[model samples]
Target: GCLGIWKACNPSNDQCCKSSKLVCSRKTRWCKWQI
Candidate 1:
Protein backbone atom coordinates (compact mmCIF):
# COMPACT_ATOMS: atom_id res chain seq x y z
CA GLY A 1 0.00 0.00 0.00
CA CYS A 2 0.97 3.63 -0.48
CA LEU A 3 2.33 5.58 2.47
CA GLY A 4 2.35 9.12 3.88
CA ILE A 5 4.43 10.96 6.45
CA TRP A 6 5.38 8.90 9.51
CA LYS A 7 3.81 5.86 7.81
CA ALA A 8 5.73 2.65 7.46
CA CYS A 9 7.16 1.93 4.01
CA ASN A 10 9.44 -0.52 2.30
CA PRO A 11 13.06 0.46 2.81
CA SER A 12 14.10 -0.96 -0.52
CA ASN A 13 11.21 0.56 -2.48
CA ASP A 14 10.89 4.31 -2.85
CA GLN A 15 7.62 3.91 -4.73
CA CYS A 16 5.93 2.80 -1.52
CA CYS A 17 5.87 6.42 -0.47
CA LYS A 18 3.10 8.16 -2.37
CA SER A 19 4.13 11.75 -1.77
CA SER A 20 6.72 13.26 -4.06
CA LYS A 21 8.18 15.11 -1.10
CA LEU A 22 8.49 12.03 1.04
CA VAL A 23 11.33 9.54 1.05
CA CYS A 24 11.68 6.19 2.74
CA SER A 25 14.23 6.20 5.52
CA ARG A 26 16.44 3.10 5.34
CA LYS A 27 16.88 2.94 9.10
CA THR A 28 13.27 3.63 10.13
CA ARG A 29 11.56 2.36 6.95
CA TRP A 30 9.08 5.18 7.24
CA CYS A 31 7.95 7.90 4.83
CA LYS A 32 9.14 11.39 5.69
CA TRP A 33 9.83 14.85 4.21
CA GLN A 34 11.82 17.75 5.56
CA ILE A 35 11.81 21.45 4.75
Candidate 2:
Protein backbone atom coordinates (compact mmCIF):
# COMPACT_ATOMS: atom_id res chain seq x y z
CA GLY A 1 0.00 0.00 0.00
CA CYS A 2 1.00 3.68 -0.36
CA LEU A 3 0.56 6.73 1.78
CA GLY A 4 0.17 10.17 0.24
CA ILE A 5 3.12 9.70 -2.12
CA TRP A 6 5.23 7.22 -0.23
CA LYS A 7 5.17 3.46 -0.84
CA ALA A 8 5.39 0.36 1.36
CA CYS A 9 8.46 -1.83 1.75
CA ASN A 10 8.51 -5.32 0.29
CA PRO A 11 9.88 -8.42 2.02
CA SER A 12 12.46 -9.69 -0.48
CA ASN A 13 12.47 -6.12 -1.74
CA ASP A 14 13.35 -4.87 1.74
CA GLN A 15 13.53 -1.49 -0.02
CA CYS A 16 11.32 1.55 -0.45
CA CYS A 17 10.06 3.89 -3.15
CA LYS A 18 10.24 7.58 -2.55
CA SER A 19 7.59 10.21 -3.21
CA SER A 20 6.83 10.31 -6.94
CA LYS A 21 4.48 13.18 -6.48
CA LEU A 22 5.89 15.92 -8.72
CA VAL A 23 8.12 13.42 -10.50
CA CYS A 24 5.87 12.20 -13.27
CA SER A 25 6.48 9.02 -15.22
CA ARG A 26 6.90 8.41 -18.97
CA LYS A 27 3.61 9.25 -20.79
CA THR A 28 2.67 10.80 -17.46
CA ARG A 29 0.58 13.92 -17.91
CA TRP A 30 2.35 17.05 -16.64
CA CYS A 31 0.63 20.12 -18.04
CA LYS A 32 3.11 22.41 -16.40
CA TRP A 33 5.85 20.99 -18.64
CA GLN A 34 3.63 21.45 -21.74
CA ILE A 35 4.13 24.11 -24.41
Candidate 3:
Protein backbone atom coordinates (compact mmCIF):
# COMPACT_ATOMS: atom_id res chain seq x y z
CA GLY A 1 0.00 0.00 0.00
CA CYS A 2 1.04 3.60 -0.65
CA LEU A 3 -0.13 6.95 0.61
CA GLY A 4 0.88 10.55 0.00
CA ILE A 5 0.38 13.90 1.78
CA TRP A 6 1.45 17.41 0.85
CA LYS A 7 1.09 20.84 2.43
CA ALA A 8 2.80 23.30 0.19
CA CYS A 9 2.59 27.11 0.32
CA ASN A 10 -0.14 26.66 2.89
CA PRO A 11 -2.21 24.03 4.62
CA SER A 12 -4.85 24.25 1.89
CA ASN A 13 -4.36 20.66 0.74
CA ASP A 14 -7.23 18.29 1.39
CA GLN A 15 -4.70 16.15 3.21
CA CYS A 16 -4.30 19.12 5.50
CA CYS A 17 -7.05 19.35 8.05
CA LYS A 18 -7.77 19.50 11.75
CA SER A 19 -10.68 19.03 14.06
CA SER A 20 -9.48 21.81 16.30
CA LYS A 21 -6.14 23.29 15.18
CA LEU A 22 -3.83 20.68 13.70
CA VAL A 23 -0.88 21.50 11.46
CA CYS A 24 0.35 20.27 8.08
CA SER A 25 4.10 19.94 8.46
CA ARG A 26 4.78 17.19 5.91
CA LYS A 27 4.73 16.91 2.13
CA THR A 28 5.80 14.89 -0.91
CA ARG A 29 5.88 11.17 -1.44
CA TRP A 30 7.05 8.73 -4.14
CA CYS A 31 7.48 5.73 -1.97
CA LYS A 32 6.87 2.22 -3.27
CA TRP A 33 5.89 -0.93 -1.50
CA GLN A 34 5.48 -4.65 -2.19
CA ILE A 35 3.61 -7.40 -0.48
Against the true structure, what is every candidate's RMSD?
A: 2.3, 10.7, 9.7
Q: Rank the candidates by lDDT, best first.
A: 1, 3, 2
For every model in order, what is the number of clashing pairs?
0, 0, 0
Q: How many backbone clashes does candidate 3 have?
A: 0
lDDT of candidates 1 onward, in order? 0.72, 0.28, 0.32
Q: By summed lDDT, which 10 consecutive residues of candidate 1 come out lowest? A: 13-22
Instruction: Supply the TM-score for candidate 3.
Output: 0.19
lDDT of 1 by residue, 1-35 (tens): 56777777878877654546688887898877772
Which parts of model 2 are misplaced by more than 4 Å?
1-7, 17-35
Ranked by TM-score, the better of candidates 1 and 2 is: 1
Q: In candidate 3, which residue pairs clash?
A: none
What's the lDDT for residue 18 in model 1? 55
Q: Is candidate 1 or candidate 3 better by lDDT?
A: 1
Query: TM-scores of all models?
Result: 0.62, 0.18, 0.19
How close to the true structure is residue 2 of candidate 3, measured as C-alpha lDDT?
16
Candidate 2 lDDT, tens digit per residue, 1-35? Answer: 22222232343332222333222222322211122
The local distance difference test score of model 2 is 0.28
- In terms of TM-score, the best-performing candidate is 1
lDDT score for residue 25 of model 1: 84
Quantify how close model 1 is to the true structure by its C-alpha RMSD in Å: 2.3
